[PDB]
């Protein structure tokens, strides 16, 4: 179910579907890795849908920076 937050359509180009997904990152088991976007009220995106390389995803995860996804990072922030 999408209610657990993984098997969702995360963005207009999202390719992830529970019937066809396969592991891609070294840290994945049976669920896609995701990252939190701070735009608006916030939302989660699949890392692979953002075209994040593993090293980049891990660097983001180990740091304290907020993240803005590819759809929202270019929107001016008041």
């Amino acid at each position: 179910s999408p209610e657990f937050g993984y098997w969702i359509t995360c963005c207009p180009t999202c390719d992830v579907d529970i019937n066809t997904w396969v592991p891609f990152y070294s840290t994945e088991l049976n669920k896609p890795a995701m990252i939190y976007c701070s735009h608006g009220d916030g939302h989660w995106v699949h890392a692979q849908c953002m075209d994040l390389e593993e090293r980049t995803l891990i660097h983001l995860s180990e740091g304290s920076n907020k993240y803005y996804c590819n759809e929202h990072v270019q929107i001016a922030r008041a």
Binding site: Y6, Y25, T27, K31, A33, M34, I58, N65
Partner: peptide
């Protein structure tokens, strides 16, 4: 940044 499924676990 907050992430999910980014660490090895046991």
């Amino acid at each position: 940044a907050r992430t999910k499924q980014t660490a090895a676990k046991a």
